[PDB]
Symmetry: C2
Subunit: 39 residues, 2 copies
């Protein structure tokens, strides 16, 4: 289980970055929607 | 009429740029999802053999 943990630790890193991207996407869409629908 | 069309195009320009940025982030997210898959694909090869 030693070689598998380095893999999982790198998976964890990528998952944080992915969550950061999803957070940016949602915020930009909220802004887009603000402009589109005039809110 | 033409002046109203200018403000419209400027916002439509802005909303398009917000969408072009979104598409870029979505591409980046897709690349991250590949790398994750390739890593889990190996965590299973090893865990399988081990």
């Amino acid at each position: 289980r030693e070689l598998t943990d380095r893999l999982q630790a790198e998976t964890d890193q990528l998952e944080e970055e992915k969550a950061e991207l999803e957070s940016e996407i949602a915020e930009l869409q909220k802004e887009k929607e603000r402009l589109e629908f005039v809110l």
